[PDB]
């Protein structure tokens, strides 16, 4: 018989484009994989940064069960007290006490699902430039692990560097169920069940604007930044869309990952064809 739990983890939700492609495909995907639970990083949901209450309910009504965040966790000030306090939402645990919000919400949570105590933890890589101070991710997660209270442990490591990501993978490989990297907005072809029985991927990717955008932003301001050096406001792209995620199923008994598959959907937009960014635009 052997009962397992089938999950679906989606990368950084970015703007209206990300919101829409998830609403239009989650049911189908949930059905295709017979998924039991859906987890998503929603750090870029509202206007490319943070999550409004309105958008939190949207994701919730779209089928999302749990949410992890990142460096833009606290941008939507108006509803943060209410949003990040949501019981099924986890923010970076890795926060230094000098930072306001160091105690606003959960950095890790536990719930049980069919004879299984499941833990979801979110952390910030030391390689990510932040306006505030953070504690060491490696040390923090190690201490949490030594607390030994969970059969499954899902980790969303929001980091910038491939070296920090893989060093993290090497450090906690068998001590956790999954180590999924996020933050670069580009999926890696890294996905696999590790030699120790965990699931790993350098970066899940993003759920937001598609080809014709720069990591979710309008190309114009981006090209200018890298050319002239102008600091002109970033703008959310409305060009097409992409959905990136990971499907994985554990085994409640051995609590080892038994299967993994990368999930990807790309929608091109004809409006990109009319663009001529070459005129360093």
Q: According to CB under 5 A, which residues from 3 to 32 bind Fe ion?
A: 12
The nearer residue to Fe ion, 4 or 73, going by C-beta atoms, is: 73
Pairwise CA distance, residues 132 & 104, whole Å: 15
Pairwise CA distance, residues 243 & 184, whole Å: 14
To the nearest whole angstrom, how small is the minimum distance from the Cβ of residue 195 to Fe ion?
A: 29
Pairwise CA distance, residues 176 & 222, whole Å: 37
The answer to whether 70 contacts Fe ion (rule: CB under 5 A) is yes
The nearer residue to Fe ion, 43 or 164, going by C-beta atoms, is: 43
Is residue 44 marked as binding? yes
Helix ranges, 115-178 (H): 137-145, 162-172
The answer to whether 71 contacts Fe ion (rule: CB under 5 A) is yes
Is residue 43 marked as binding? yes
To the nearest whole angstrom, how small is the minimum distance from the Cβ of residue 160 to Fe ion?
A: 8
Is residue 20 marked as binding? no
Among the residue ranges 71-79, 114-122, 166-174, 255-263, the one whose residues contact Fe ion (CB under 5 A):
71-79
Site string for Fe ion, 101-140 (x = CB under 5 A): ----------------------------------------
- For residues 14 and 48, is the Cβ–Cβ distance under 8 A? yes
Among the residue ranges 35-43, 80-88, 226-234, 261-269, the one whose residues contact Fe ion (CB under 5 A):
35-43
Is residue 153 marked as binding? no
Nearest CA among 200, 66, 71 for reference residue 121: 66
Pairwise CA distance, residues 96 & 71, whole Å: 14
- Does the annotation count 72 as an active-site position? yes
Q: Using DSSP, state whether 54 is helix, strand or coil.
A: helix
Is residue 71 marked as binding? yes
Pairwise CA distance, residues 222 & 216, whole Å: 10
Nearest CA among 179, 191, 170 for reference residue 152: 179
Is residue 233 marked as binding? no
How many residues lie near Fe ion (CB under 5 A)? 6
The answer to whether 183 contacts Fe ion (rule: CB under 5 A) is yes
User: Which residue in the set 44, 135, 213, 218 belongs to the binding site for Fe ion (CB under 5 A)?
Assistant: 44
Nearest CA among 38, 50, 39, 44 for reference residue 12: 44
Site string for Fe ion, 203-242 (x = CB under 5 A): ----------------------------------------
Q: Supply the Cα-derived Rg of the chain in whole angstroms.
A: 18
Nearest CA among 57, 81, 59 for reference residue 14: 59
Structure letter (DSSP) for residue 274: T
To the nearest whole angstrom, how small is the minimum distance from the Cβ of residue 71 to Fe ion?
A: 5
Residue 128 tokens read as 């990510």
- Annotated active-site positions, please? 72
Binding-site entries for Fe cation: 12, 43-44, 71, 158, 183, 185
**Could you list the residues that contact Fe ion (CB under 5 A)?**
12, 43-44, 70-71, 183
């Amino acid at each position: 018989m052997m009962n397992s739990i089938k999950f679906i983890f989606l990368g950084d939700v970015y703007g209206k484009a990300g919101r829409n492609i998830i609403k239009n495909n989650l049911a189908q995907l949930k059905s295709k994989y017979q998924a039991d639970l859906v987890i998503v990083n929603a750090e870029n949901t509202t206007h490319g940064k943070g999550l409004s209450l309105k958008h939190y309910e949207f994701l919730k009504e779209a089928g999302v069960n749990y949410i992890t965040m990142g460096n833009h966790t606290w941008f939507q000030k108006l509803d943060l007290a209410v949003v990040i306090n949501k019981k099924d939402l986890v923010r970076p645990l890795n926060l230094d006490t000098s930072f306001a919000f160091h105690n606003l919400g959960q950095g890790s949570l536990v719930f049980e699902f069919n004879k299984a105590k499941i833990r979801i933890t979110n952390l910030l890589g030391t390689s990510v430039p932040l306006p505030f101070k953070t504690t060491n991710p490696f040390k923090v997660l190690k201490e949490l692990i030594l607390k030994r209270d969970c059969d499954l442990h899902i980790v969303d490591f929001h980091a910038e560097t491939t070296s920090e990501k893989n060093a993290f993978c090497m450090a906690f490989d068998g001590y956790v169920t999954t180590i999924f990297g996020t933050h670069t907005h580009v999926p890696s072809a890294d996905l696999r069940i590790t030699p120790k029985g965990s699931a790993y991927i350098t970066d899940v990717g993003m759920c937001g604007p598609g080809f014709g955008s720069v990591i979710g932003a309008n190309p114009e301001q981006s090209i200018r930044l890298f050319c002239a050096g102008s600091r002109e406001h970033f703008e959310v792209s409305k060009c097409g869309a992409q959905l990136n995620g990971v499907f994985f199923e554990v085994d409640v008994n051995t609590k080892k990952v038994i299967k993994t598959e990368a999930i990807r959907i790309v929608e091109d937009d004809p409006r990109y064809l009319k663009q001529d960014y070459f005129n360093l635009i």
